[PDB]
Structure 1
Amino acid sequence: ALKDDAVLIAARGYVYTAAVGTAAPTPSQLKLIDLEHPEAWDRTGWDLVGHTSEDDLPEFGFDGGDSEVRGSWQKKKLREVETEEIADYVVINLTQFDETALELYFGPNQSATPGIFGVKSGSVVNERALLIVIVDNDVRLGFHARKASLKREDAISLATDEFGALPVRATFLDYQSYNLYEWIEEDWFNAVDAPVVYLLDLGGATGGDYTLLVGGKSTGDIAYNANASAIKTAIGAVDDGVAESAWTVTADGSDFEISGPLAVALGVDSTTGGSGVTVDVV
């Protein structure tokens, strides 16, 4: 279904890392968590990766994944076969230059003396857990990987007016029978299939009649004191392809549930009392 609440702009976001395997905040915690302070979290061990580029948001790419359509002499297209496997990564453009951000790009500090960061000959291993939180007016698309192997992706960028940047690629590694990686919103994933209810209210009406509008098409006159079976009858009697048995209607005085296969609204109202009729959605 088309949901307008789940279309996402990445307007601000945060990136965290920890020793491999650490649990991210649970999907109920992630909406209450304070993002700038990993020292305050109930899921301890996360810490911030430092500032990250506004121009270069994390690129959730892949490499490999080529495939060909194959078939017999008889039927030319019957399976699509992978030539080589997908491998999954994210590219992160760090911009802070502390040890806390050079360590992801170069690997662990190779010298112990104060005020320097030392580097050795190549092929160091730098596996780390990764958490990312993309935040849009307090909707929070969370992403977590139990293990990722980090490597530098391209040269260190410098400029005279833009920020310098340390582009690092995290490649996702399968860890200890956990998932490869994982997305964390309470309201969007494995959520309960609750049908839409139009919450009609007669609003203190007295005398006269009103008309429902369903799928953009209008029913007849509904009396200010009509019952649930009559309302269900009048919606089902709209010339619009769905039977009466497709609908439900349930009552509490002025309050009604209406629910079924199409959108419901109000056309004309002449019910001469209170606010007149209204229609909310649950």
Structure 2
Amino acid sequence: ALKDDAVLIAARGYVYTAAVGTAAPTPSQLKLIDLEHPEAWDRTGWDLVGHTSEDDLPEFGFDGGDSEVRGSWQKKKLREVETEEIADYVVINLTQFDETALELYFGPNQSATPGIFGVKSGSVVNERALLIVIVDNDVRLGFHARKASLKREDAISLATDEFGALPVRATFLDYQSYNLYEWIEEDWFNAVDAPVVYLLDLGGATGGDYTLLVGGKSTGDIAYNANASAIKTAIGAVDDGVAESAWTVTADGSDFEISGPLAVALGVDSTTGGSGVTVDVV
């Protein structure tokens, strides 16, 4: 079907790397994190690859994919066979000459000396997890590969009125039972029917001092004499990246409907009236 908000014009592309197998931000975190400071994220281990030419994007590519139709002298077309299976890659033109930019291109520094970066002869093993985030509009199509081999795509480019650049090709390789790579966007892939709601029960009103965890992070605690606005302010004050304005909470007397940008569950339970005010189900 046609979707005017799934049409994409990549405006800027951030690129991050980490040790092999490192997990990317989940689809619901990718809408809330900032892209400029990876040391702030929940998924520690990622860091920015460096500056990239800001009129250009990470250049996807492949080689192989050479495929042709085959048959028998009875029936002339019956399969298309892929003769050389697709080897899939992305090219990244760093413009930095910092050590942490050269290590993507040359592999690890071979000298201990302050102020020198040394290169040895022969091939190097150099492979990383790779996360790319492509930004347009308020969209953030992420891309994640758990293992990519990094190699020099071409020699270092220097020019008298265009920035110096050192291009790496990251080639994707499969790793354990995981996928070759994954695209990350919560609105587009495996999407639910639009609303989700959690029903916080209230029938156990003899009560106590229970609490919620929201996206895994605690709200402190809430007393049994609860109110829809009071629990919206409690949930909306969890320090997780998203404000009280994003949450919708309403009542049907015996329970509250809770809804918003993140998962909600009960943490520590404390109540006299059995399960009746410590139930939170979808």
Does the 8 Å contact 1:247/1:260 carry over to 2?
yes
Deviation sequence 1:55-92 (CA, Å, 0-9, x none):
44212111111111011222211110111111111111
Query: Which residue of 2 is the match for residue 103 of structure 1?
Result: 103
Deviation sequence 1:109-160 (CA, Å, 0-9, x none):
0011111111110201101110000111221010000010000001111111
Does the 8 Å contact 1:203/1:274 carry over to 2?
no
Distance 2:10 2:178 in 1: 27
SS state at 2:5 partner: helix
Seen in structure 2, the aligned counterparts of structure 1 residues 143 and 215 have a Cα distance that, compared at 3 Å, is: closer
Does the 8 Å contact 2:204/2:271 carry over to 1?
no
Cα offset, 1:273, TM superposition = 51
SS state at 2:135 partner: strand
Cα offset, 1:161, TM superposition = 1.2
Query: Which residue of 2 is the match for residue 220 of structure 1?
Result: 220
TM-score, normalised via structure 1 length = 0.68
Distance 1:61 1:252 in 2: 54
Cα offset, 1:274, TM superposition = 50
Distance 2:116 2:218 in 1: 76
Seen in structure 2, the aligned counterparts of structure 1 residues 154 and 203 have a Cα distance that, compared at 3 Å, is: farther
Does the 8 Å contact 1:198/1:279 carry over to 2?
no
Distance 2:244 2:101 in 1: 64
After the TM superposition, which segments of 4 or more aligned residues of structure 1 sit over 4 Å from their partners? 193-282
Seen in structure 2, the aligned counterparts of structure 1 residues 107 and 186 have a Cα distance that, compared at 3 Å, is: same
Distance 1:168 1:190 in 2: 32
**Structure 1 range deviating more: 240-249 or 119-128:** 240-249
Seen in structure 2, the aligned counterparts of structure 1 residues 273 and 70 have a Cα distance that, compared at 3 Å, is: same
Distance 1:167 1:77 in 2: 42
Seen in structure 2, the aligned counterparts of structure 1 residues 108 and 188 have a Cα distance that, compared at 3 Å, is: same
Distance 1:189 1:115 in 2: 47
Does the 8 Å contact 1:205/1:274 carry over to 2?
no
Deviation sequence 1:27-64 (CA, Å, 0-9, x none):
00001001110110000000000101234421211111
Seen in structure 2, the aligned counterparts of structure 1 residues 180 and 234 have a Cα distance that, compared at 3 Å, is: closer
SS state at 1:105 partner: helix
Distance 2:140 2:20 in 1: 23
Query: Which residue of 2 is the match for residue 209 of structure 1?
Result: 209
CA RMSD of aligned residues (A): 14.3
Query: Which residue of 1 is the match for residue 26 of structure 2?
Result: 26
Does the 8 Å contact 1:204/1:254 carry over to 2?
no
SS state at 1:29 partner: helix
Seen in structure 2, the aligned counterparts of structure 1 residues 75 and 216 have a Cα distance that, compared at 3 Å, is: farther
Q: Percent identity?
A: 100
Give the gaps of 5 or more residues in structure 1: none
Distance 1:50 1:89 in 2: 19
Matches within 5 A, 1:237-256: none
Seen in structure 2, the aligned counterparts of structure 1 residues 52 and 73 have a Cα distance that, compared at 3 Å, is: same
Seen in structure 2, the aligned counterparts of structure 1 residues 33 and 264 have a Cα distance that, compared at 3 Å, is: closer
Does the 8 Å contact 1:14/1:134 carry over to 2?
yes
Does the 8 Å contact 1:89/1:170 carry over to 2?
yes
Seen in structure 2, the aligned counterparts of structure 1 residues 277 and 15 have a Cα distance that, compared at 3 Å, is: closer
Cα offset, 1:97, TM superposition = 0.8
**Structure 1 range deviating more: 115-124 or 220-229:** 220-229
Does the 8 Å contact 1:211/1:220 carry over to 2?
yes
Distance 1:19 1:237 in 2: 34
Does the 8 Å contact 1:205/1:275 carry over to 2?
no
Does the 8 Å contact 1:69/1:78 carry over to 2?
yes
Give the gaps of 5 or more residues in structure 2: none
Does the 8 Å contact 1:65/1:82 carry over to 2?
yes
Distance 1:56 1:40 in 2: 26
Cα offset, 1:279, TM superposition = 38
Query: Which residue of 2 is the match for residue 183 of structure 1?
Result: 183
Q: Which has the larger radius of gyration?
A: 1
**Structure 1 range deviating more: 230-239 or 55-64:** 230-239
Does the 8 Å contact 2:28/2:262 carry over to 1?
no
Deviation sequence 1:245-267 (CA, Å, 0-9, x none):
99999999999999999999999
**Structure 1 range deviating more: 86-95 or 253-262:** 253-262
SS state at 1:190 partner: coil
Distance 1:89 1:56 in 2: 17
Distance 1:47 1:220 in 2: 32
